Amino acid sequence: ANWFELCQMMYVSGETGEPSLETTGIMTKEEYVTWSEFRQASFTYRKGKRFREWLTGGGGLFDPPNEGRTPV
Amino acid sequence: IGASHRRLRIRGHDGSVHAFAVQHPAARHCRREERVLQLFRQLNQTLANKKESRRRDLQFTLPLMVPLAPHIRIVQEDTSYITLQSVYEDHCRRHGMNKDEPILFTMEKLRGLMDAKALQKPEQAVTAKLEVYRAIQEKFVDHTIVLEYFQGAYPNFADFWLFRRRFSYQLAALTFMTYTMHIDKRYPHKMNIARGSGNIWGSEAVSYMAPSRPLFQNTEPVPFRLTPNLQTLMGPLATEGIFAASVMAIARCLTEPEQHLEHALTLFVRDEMMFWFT
Amino acid sequence: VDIVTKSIELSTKAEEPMNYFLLLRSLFRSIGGGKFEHLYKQILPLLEMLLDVLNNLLMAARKPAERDLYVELCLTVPARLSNLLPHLSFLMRPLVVALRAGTELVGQGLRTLELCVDNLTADYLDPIMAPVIDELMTALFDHLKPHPYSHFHAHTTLRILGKLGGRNRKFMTEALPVTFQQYVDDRASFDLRLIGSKRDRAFPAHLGI
Amino acid sequence: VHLYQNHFRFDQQEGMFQYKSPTVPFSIHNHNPYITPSPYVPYPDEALAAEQERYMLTLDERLSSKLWEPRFERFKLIENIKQEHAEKKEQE
Amino acid sequence: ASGLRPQADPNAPTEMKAYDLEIQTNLILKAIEVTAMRMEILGDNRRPFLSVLATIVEKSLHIPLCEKILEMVEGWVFRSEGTWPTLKEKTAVLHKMISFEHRTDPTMLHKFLNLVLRIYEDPKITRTELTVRMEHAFLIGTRAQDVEMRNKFMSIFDKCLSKTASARLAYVILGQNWDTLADSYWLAQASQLLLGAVDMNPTIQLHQD
Amino acid sequence: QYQLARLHEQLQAATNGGRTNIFK
Amino acid sequence: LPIPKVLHDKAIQMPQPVPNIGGAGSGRPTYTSGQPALPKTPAFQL
Amino acid sequence: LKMNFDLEIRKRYASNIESRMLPFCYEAGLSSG
Amino acid sequence: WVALFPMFWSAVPKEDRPDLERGLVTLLTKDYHSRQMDKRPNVVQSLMAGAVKTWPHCKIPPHVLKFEAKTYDAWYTALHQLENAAIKPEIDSAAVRESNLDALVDLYSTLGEDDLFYGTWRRRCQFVETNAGLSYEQHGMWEKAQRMYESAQIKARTGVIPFSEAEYMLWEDHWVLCAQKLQQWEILQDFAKHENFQDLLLECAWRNTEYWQNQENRDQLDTVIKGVMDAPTPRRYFFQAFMSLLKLHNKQETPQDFNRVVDEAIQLSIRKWHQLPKRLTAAHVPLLQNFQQLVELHDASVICQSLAQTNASNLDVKSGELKLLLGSWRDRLPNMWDDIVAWQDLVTWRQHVFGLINATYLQLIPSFAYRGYHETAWIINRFAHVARKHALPEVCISQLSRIYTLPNIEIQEAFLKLREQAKCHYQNPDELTSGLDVINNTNLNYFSAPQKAEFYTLKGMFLEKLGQKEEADTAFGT
């Protein structure tokens, strides 16, 4: 539970990557808007009940553009 | 190789098909061959009833022969037979060689040497004959011809593997037959190989008897035919595993009581002795 | 008796000979089971002729559906098992045909074969089955496939083989068939060019014919 | 005590003690008087090689790991069991 | 349809009348249309909306509802310009459309595959985060039973790769992930890709021998 | 400890568990 | 003898990788046989 | 009839943590391991 | 695909081939191929065939091929390359040659090819005792082979001559196999107890009929069966089904559970059958024997249900159906040239069933209640005949002597005993003392005229062998 809250908080804290399931288990106008929206992620906001109860050259067709970014 | 025949086919009342070869100029030694086939057809029963041989499926290959006249005969026929001589000739045709080169080479060399001195060799095993043999091996016939042919004859490797497995056992059986009965002149055109299963039939199999006195003898440099090309077709692993053991298995099965073989051979030997004396 | 005899006789001159065999199938499907002893006694004197005629037509059939009709006619004649014990050699070829066909014929053939295996002794049955035994066992071994394949057919085949026992690995008389090519030369081909290469390569002229 | 190249044993010992303890091998064309001869023979930088050998020994359970001091424990156990069984049978 | 017997479970599925089903479907369409126009302020209610959309797409068999959801997703992907539905979460909704492959009705699958072809032919979208994530849909398209659609997918595939033979063999061996097609014989696609490195123009003939 | 255990195991194997005298 | 319809669940599941059990050992070039439907692949690094 | 628990403990004197774990489990009495 | 791959491989530059070979090995061992293991032509078969078509220029490690061939039905494709590499090694290294030979021997063993296995191992060993022992194993002489292996181990103990580890393992494994052939299960039980060999322990315990009657003993055996059941095999499933039958007999299980267990076993057996080559090899025979065992299991379950539901009220005249079923079983036997272990298995299973029948019947007495004993005598006699035809030493004598203690002497039992006595005349040398002792006094000839006539004929033959011509003349004249 609270996986999405953890992902949003990690994005806010400065981790823009895609963290794995185990990791959670253990600017431009659009970017600024997303940051402002995600800053409001909270554990208990309208969640009181939930909170209490809880090389190869060439290329191809699907090659990533630049990669080089990994989660923590 | 030196004959021809017409092939008849008959349909049975149950739907089966049977093939026969008509031999119009039948050889002069047909009765003796039929007697040999009779004897080994009798021994096949003991082979089928014994355990060490029944689990290996060891049997002699003996087609049925029926004479119609003293000079015509019909013989059960396998349509996928080929002889060793035919394989050698096919190789020669495909590789642009003359099939008669080895024999002409041998004759020329032996003539040239016999015109010179023909002594000083250790006792009789002439070293010049060994040199001629080595030269023929080096220049004309290498030991990978039959294996190459049969590898080319089977696009699917499972077929080749099964064919070779059958071939080894059949060769062991033929070796026992020719060794015990003193069958002498085993030329390459007398060995027929079935491409559909891997069976071996030896044609014109008759025992040899000494002219001076009545008894069985061979008097040849080798006990049986096992040449480099056959060795290469079988392979060292199969030669160690199947061929050597099957001969002993057959010999053990057929001599369990020693009286059985004597009582089986008595009438055959009597007929041979009567023919010799006549 | 008149129905059967007239159907067989009139099939030879008809414009559509198969209608009479459709009629015969309709009749046979209705009087199955040992509930019609009187009709079986009436029909008994026609059994051998009917089976011989049916076997003749199967050999000359050129389409799968016609073969199916004749096989179904052969395997469902109205008779008692004791009266069918002779003439059992007339059922061997249609059985082999049915064991390699759609689901219904496969089930019918399995039923017939199980009945024969259960109701007779080896010394009586094996000589009758000898002419077709290799094809029979090859067809039987083709129904042994795991779950997604029909488990009814597979389990029936396994039961039949288990009941046969030691006789299920004793039927072979020849060595084993192997396929071979009549010549050892190269096969016919034409040349092709790979874009990055500098030479031509042979391509067999027999791939989808 | 008798000393050898890589093992030693006591005078009345039927085994050996290692110092580390507490033609053409594997060819089918070789010959010896108890097997038939082969028709393929006459009648009777290093990093790359190591990498190739490592690649060739892939999935080979026992040899890949290695890439050996027998003690005969099972043989001795069988001997002991047989002796005990014979001794027990002697009583009856 | 599967024939499974019913159970006395209060939460057991229950059937509905056609009239009631249509009334409820129209109500659902209206509700979805009203909800979709406030996407920019949905806030915390966004995820449940997409979850229910995915559930409907996965399980519903009503064609018009699926068509409308597909058009809405297409509008989000292509003609939308403002802040998106959680950015690349529309890909999550698209990934649920892959279940159309075995619906025994190919209309919705054909619409989805047309959308995929439209996505992968766009000059703007190339080597981006969408074409990377739509690989499974593209491969499913390359496996299509419809000849025209499969040929379109294979034409795009062939146009992408390099024409050297060694390059294409290398791509097949260690360039493509085949996990999506693991239940089918996917070497046919590989052979078709390989044959794109051969010259088709020259005349051919059998060897002189 | 480990060395002593290994030595004891080796000696027991060599002596056949005390049934054999190798020191004479 | 009996041939039930459908078949129960445990008999129609897809095989899964299985380890080598028995205590004898693996990789012995002898004439012993034992075999599961789907053995598990050994670990390796190339 | 039984299990020779003393043959497996001796292997401690012969990944690494897994190797050392089982002898400890058998010695204590954990047949499950 | 198999036509196209060799032509495209030759267009790859020689310096880029190792990378493609590594990628090919990576592709062959993917785990998602298991979703396709039952389909005829799968992709693993095609890839292996294409790679082996170009073998000298495209190299795959032998053990990868061996692993894939067993799972995806590519046996002969792997055999082709393994034998070719045996003839002409690709690398001049001893380790590569040893690995190739190990893989080839494993394939030969799994396919049931005994002679190729023996030849390959005899062209490879270093000791002469290993050679002789393998040769004697090849011809069915287990005692000489066991002696040879013992002597080879003793010679190796000296340590003067080096030897390989594979020969070391071979000595032990084939000594155990020879021990199994000679029916030395009593020492094998202790060996498996000490070595923690669970399958061998189960096999040894399976031969003790009286050990499965105690509740505690079979409770103990249930733990071992549960232990070796996380890696199911057909034999382990047979043991599980036998346990289920025993539980059903003692009213601890419903017939539905027994049916479910049998269904699972049958499914596994069919799955293993489908993984072999299509044409009938020597690896198919044990699966057919397993099929027979599986059908007889259901037959026995029906027997047990009828026995309980019939004799729960002490009702007789229910032995007719038992007689019919037993007569049906009496005609379903293996072939004479089959493996002796299969005969052992059949005899043990029949004895278990007959023991169940005897246990249920005898207690009711305090002619119709002594049928299990007759059946046991019949099957023991047949097994003794088969063992004699196999030249097994003392096995047939042991089986015959294992029948002296049997109550319920009757006409049928007397006839079976007389048949056993007649069969005891093995007609072998060094039996003069036993023959003379039998001649002095043995049973009575009042039973049947043919039996005494044949006994007189045998006595005359024995006298002739000893050298009493006139005595034998008079004997067989009478």
PDB file of N, CA and C in Angstrom, chain E residues 131-177:
ATOM      1  N   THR E 131       7.241   4.670 -28.582  1.00  0.00           N
ATOM      2  CA  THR E 131       7.612   3.569 -29.459  1.00  0.00           C
ATOM      3  C   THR E 131       8.396   2.493 -28.724  1.00  0.00           C
ATOM      4  N   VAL E 132       9.097   2.857 -27.649  1.00  0.00           N
ATOM      5  CA  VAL E 132       9.784   1.859 -26.839  1.00  0.00           C
ATOM      6  C   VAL E 132       8.776   0.980 -26.111  1.00  0.00           C
ATOM      7  N   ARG E 133       7.694   1.576 -25.612  1.00  0.00           N
ATOM      8  CA  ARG E 133       6.719   0.848 -24.813  1.00  0.00           C
ATOM      9  C   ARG E 133       5.659   0.135 -25.645  1.00  0.00           C
ATOM     10  N   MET E 134       5.512   0.473 -26.928  1.00  0.00           N
ATOM     11  CA  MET E 134       4.511  -0.171 -27.774  1.00  0.00           C
ATOM     12  C   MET E 134       5.057  -1.390 -28.530  1.00  0.00           C
ATOM     13  N   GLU E 135       6.183  -1.949 -28.074  1.00  0.00           N
ATOM     14  CA  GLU E 135       6.822  -3.056 -28.782  1.00  0.00           C
ATOM     15  C   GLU E 135       5.930  -4.291 -28.827  1.00  0.00           C
ATOM     16  N   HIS E 136       5.276  -4.616 -27.712  1.00  0.00           N
ATOM     17  CA  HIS E 136       4.458  -5.823 -27.671  1.00  0.00           C
ATOM     18  C   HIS E 136       3.293  -5.726 -28.647  1.00  0.00           C
ATOM     19  N   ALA E 137       2.647  -4.559 -28.709  1.00  0.00           N
ATOM     20  CA  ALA E 137       1.571  -4.358 -29.673  1.00  0.00           C
ATOM     21  C   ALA E 137       2.091  -4.456 -31.100  1.00  0.00           C
ATOM     22  N   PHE E 138       3.270  -3.889 -31.366  1.00  0.00           N
ATOM     23  CA  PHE E 138       3.824  -3.990 -32.713  1.00  0.00           C
ATOM     24  C   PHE E 138       4.075  -5.447 -33.102  1.00  0.00           C
ATOM     25  N   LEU E 139       4.633  -6.242 -32.187  1.00  0.00           N
ATOM     26  CA  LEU E 139       4.906  -7.643 -32.504  1.00  0.00           C
ATOM     27  C   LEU E 139       3.613  -8.430 -32.700  1.00  0.00           C
ATOM     28  N   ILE E 140       2.614  -8.183 -31.849  1.00  0.00           N
ATOM     29  CA  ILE E 140       1.310  -8.809 -32.043  1.00  0.00           C
ATOM     30  C   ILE E 140       0.776  -8.476 -33.429  1.00  0.00           C
ATOM     31  N   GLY E 141       0.960  -7.230 -33.866  1.00  0.00           N
ATOM     32  CA  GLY E 141       0.554  -6.867 -35.213  1.00  0.00           C
ATOM     33  C   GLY E 141       1.308  -7.638 -36.279  1.00  0.00           C
ATOM     34  N   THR E 142       2.618  -7.814 -36.089  1.00  0.00           N
ATOM     35  CA  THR E 142       3.394  -8.604 -37.043  1.00  0.00           C
ATOM     36  C   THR E 142       2.960 -10.064 -37.068  1.00  0.00           C
ATOM     37  N   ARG E 143       2.243 -10.528 -36.047  1.00  0.00           N
ATOM     38  CA  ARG E 143       1.737 -11.897 -36.024  1.00  0.00           C
ATOM     39  C   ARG E 143       0.289 -12.013 -36.514  1.00  0.00           C
ATOM     40  N   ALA E 144      -0.285 -10.943 -37.061  1.00  0.00           N
ATOM     41  CA  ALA E 144      -1.719 -10.908 -37.329  1.00  0.00           C
ATOM     42  C   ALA E 144      -2.131 -11.949 -38.367  1.00  0.00           C
ATOM     43  N   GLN E 145      -3.338 -12.492 -38.185  1.00  0.00           N
ATOM     44  CA  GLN E 145      -3.936 -13.414 -39.145  1.00  0.00           C
ATOM     45  C   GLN E 145      -4.497 -12.713 -40.374  1.00  0.00           C
ATOM     46  N   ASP E 146      -4.672 -11.396 -40.329  1.00  0.00           N
ATOM     47  CA  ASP E 146      -5.119 -10.645 -41.493  1.00  0.00           C
ATOM     48  C   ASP E 146      -3.922 -10.328 -42.381  1.00  0.00           C
ATOM     49  N   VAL E 147      -4.029 -10.680 -43.663  1.00  0.00           N
ATOM     50  CA  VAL E 147      -2.879 -10.593 -44.560  1.00  0.00           C
ATOM     51  C   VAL E 147      -2.439  -9.145 -44.746  1.00  0.00           C
ATOM     52  N   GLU E 148      -3.388  -8.234 -44.967  1.00  0.00           N
ATOM     53  CA  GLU E 148      -3.031  -6.844 -45.240  1.00  0.00           C
ATOM     54  C   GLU E 148      -2.357  -6.196 -44.035  1.00  0.00           C
ATOM     55  N   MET E 149      -2.923  -6.390 -42.843  1.00  0.00           N
ATOM     56  CA  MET E 149      -2.346  -5.796 -41.642  1.00  0.00           C
ATOM     57  C   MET E 149      -0.951  -6.349 -41.373  1.00  0.00           C
ATOM     58  N   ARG E 150      -0.792  -7.668 -41.491  1.00  0.00           N
ATOM     59  CA  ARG E 150       0.512  -8.279 -41.271  1.00  0.00           C
ATOM     60  C   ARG E 150       1.527  -7.763 -42.278  1.00  0.00           C
ATOM     61  N   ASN E 151       1.109  -7.594 -43.532  1.00  0.00           N
ATOM     62  CA  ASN E 151       2.026  -7.090 -44.546  1.00  0.00           C
ATOM     63  C   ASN E 151       2.416  -5.645 -44.269  1.00  0.00           C
ATOM     64  N   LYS E 152       1.483  -4.830 -43.771  1.00  0.00           N
ATOM     65  CA  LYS E 152       1.830  -3.457 -43.403  1.00  0.00           C
ATOM     66  C   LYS E 152       2.864  -3.436 -42.281  1.00  0.00           C
ATOM     67  N   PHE E 153       2.637  -4.246 -41.244  1.00  0.00           N
ATOM     68  CA  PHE E 153       3.579  -4.304 -40.130  1.00  0.00           C
ATOM     69  C   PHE E 153       4.953  -4.766 -40.602  1.00  0.00           C
ATOM     70  N   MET E 154       4.988  -5.810 -41.433  1.00  0.00           N
ATOM     71  CA  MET E 154       6.263  -6.322 -41.921  1.00  0.00           C
ATOM     72  C   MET E 154       6.945  -5.331 -42.852  1.00  0.00           C
ATOM     73  N   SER E 155       6.173  -4.547 -43.607  1.00  0.00           N
ATOM     74  CA  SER E 155       6.766  -3.522 -44.456  1.00  0.00           C
ATOM     75  C   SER E 155       7.459  -2.456 -43.621  1.00  0.00           C
ATOM     76  N   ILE E 156       6.808  -1.997 -42.550  1.00  0.00           N
ATOM     77  CA  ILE E 156       7.462  -1.032 -41.665  1.00  0.00           C
ATOM     78  C   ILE E 156       8.723  -1.644 -41.063  1.00  0.00           C
ATOM     79  N   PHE E 157       8.612  -2.887 -40.586  1.00  0.00           N
ATOM     80  CA  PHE E 157       9.756  -3.562 -39.978  1.00  0.00           C
ATOM     81  C   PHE E 157      10.931  -3.636 -40.946  1.00  0.00           C
ATOM     82  N   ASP E 158      10.669  -4.050 -42.187  1.00  0.00           N
ATOM     83  CA  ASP E 158      11.731  -4.159 -43.181  1.00  0.00           C
ATOM     84  C   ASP E 158      12.323  -2.796 -43.508  1.00  0.00           C
ATOM     85  N   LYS E 159      11.477  -1.772 -43.635  1.00  0.00           N
ATOM     86  CA  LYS E 159      11.983  -0.439 -43.938  1.00  0.00           C
ATOM     87  C   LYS E 159      12.910   0.063 -42.841  1.00  0.00           C
ATOM     88  N   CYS E 160      12.681  -0.351 -41.593  1.00  0.00           N
ATOM     89  CA  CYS E 160      13.501   0.167 -40.500  1.00  0.00           C
ATOM     90  C   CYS E 160      14.945  -0.324 -40.584  1.00  0.00           C
ATOM     91  N   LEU E 161      15.144  -1.627 -40.772  1.00  0.00           N
ATOM     92  CA  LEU E 161      16.451  -2.233 -40.552  1.00  0.00           C
ATOM     93  C   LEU E 161      17.403  -1.973 -41.719  1.00  0.00           C
ATOM     94  N   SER E 162      18.679  -2.266 -41.476  1.00  0.00           N
ATOM     95  CA  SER E 162      19.716  -2.149 -42.492  1.00  0.00           C
ATOM     96  C   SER E 162      19.697  -3.358 -43.422  1.00  0.00           C
ATOM     97  N   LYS E 163      20.144  -3.142 -44.657  1.00  0.00           N
ATOM     98  CA  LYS E 163      19.960  -4.108 -45.732  1.00  0.00           C
ATOM     99  C   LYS E 163      21.104  -5.106 -45.866  1.00  0.00           C
ATOM    100  N   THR E 164      22.165  -4.979 -45.076  1.00  0.00           N
ATOM    101  CA  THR E 164      23.240  -5.960 -45.121  1.00  0.00           C
ATOM    102  C   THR E 164      22.792  -7.267 -44.474  1.00  0.00           C
ATOM    103  N   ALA E 165      23.292  -8.381 -45.014  1.00  0.00           N
ATOM    104  CA  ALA E 165      22.846  -9.694 -44.558  1.00  0.00           C
ATOM    105  C   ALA E 165      23.386 -10.020 -43.171  1.00  0.00           C
ATOM    106  N   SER E 166      24.672  -9.752 -42.938  1.00  0.00           N
ATOM    107  CA  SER E 166      25.249 -10.007 -41.623  1.00  0.00           C
ATOM    108  C   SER E 166      24.568  -9.158 -40.558  1.00  0.00           C
ATOM    109  N   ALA E 167      24.247  -7.907 -40.892  1.00  0.00           N
ATOM    110  CA  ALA E 167      23.554  -7.043 -39.944  1.00  0.00           C
ATOM    111  C   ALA E 167      22.196  -7.618 -39.564  1.00  0.00           C
ATOM    112  N   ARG E 168      21.465  -8.162 -40.538  1.00  0.00           N
ATOM    113  CA  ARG E 168      20.128  -8.669 -40.244  1.00  0.00           C
ATOM    114  C   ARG E 168      20.191  -9.974 -39.460  1.00  0.00           C
ATOM    115  N   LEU E 169      21.161 -10.838 -39.771  1.00  0.00           N
ATOM    116  CA  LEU E 169      21.346 -12.034 -38.954  1.00  0.00           C
ATOM    117  C   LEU E 169      21.704 -11.662 -37.519  1.00  0.00           C
ATOM    118  N   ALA E 170      22.590 -10.677 -37.346  1.00  0.00           N
ATOM    119  CA  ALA E 170      22.955 -10.235 -36.005  1.00  0.00           C
ATOM    120  C   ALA E 170      21.751  -9.665 -35.266  1.00  0.00           C
ATOM    121  N   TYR E 171      20.921  -8.880 -35.957  1.00  0.00           N
ATOM    122  CA  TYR E 171      19.732  -8.330 -35.317  1.00  0.00           C
ATOM    123  C   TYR E 171      18.790  -9.437 -34.870  1.00  0.00           C
ATOM    124  N   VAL E 172      18.591 -10.451 -35.713  1.00  0.00           N
ATOM    125  CA  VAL E 172      17.713 -11.556 -35.336  1.00  0.00           C
ATOM    126  C   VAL E 172      18.274 -12.300 -34.129  1.00  0.00           C
ATOM    127  N   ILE E 173      19.582 -12.567 -34.125  1.00  0.00           N
ATOM    128  CA  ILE E 173      20.153 -13.409 -33.077  1.00  0.00           C
ATOM    129  C   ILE E 173      20.204 -12.672 -31.741  1.00  0.00           C
ATOM    130  N   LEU E 174      20.659 -11.413 -31.736  1.00  0.00           N
ATOM    131  CA  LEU E 174      20.826 -10.694 -30.475  1.00  0.00           C
ATOM    132  C   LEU E 174      20.371  -9.241 -30.571  1.00  0.00           C
ATOM    133  N   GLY E 175      19.369  -8.958 -31.398  1.00  0.00           N
ATOM    134  CA  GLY E 175      18.873  -7.602 -31.540  1.00  0.00           C
ATOM    135  C   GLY E 175      17.438  -7.443 -31.084  1.00  0.00           C
ATOM    136  N   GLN E 176      16.652  -8.507 -31.202  1.00  0.00           N
ATOM    137  CA  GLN E 176      15.233  -8.483 -30.890  1.00  0.00           C
ATOM    138  C   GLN E 176      14.932  -9.365 -29.685  1.00  0.00           C
ATOM    139  N   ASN E 177      13.964  -8.927 -28.883  1.00  0.00           N
ATOM    140  CA  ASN E 177      13.414  -9.722 -27.795  1.00  0.00           C
ATOM    141  C   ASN E 177      12.156 -10.418 -28.298  1.00  0.00           C
TER     142      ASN E 177
END
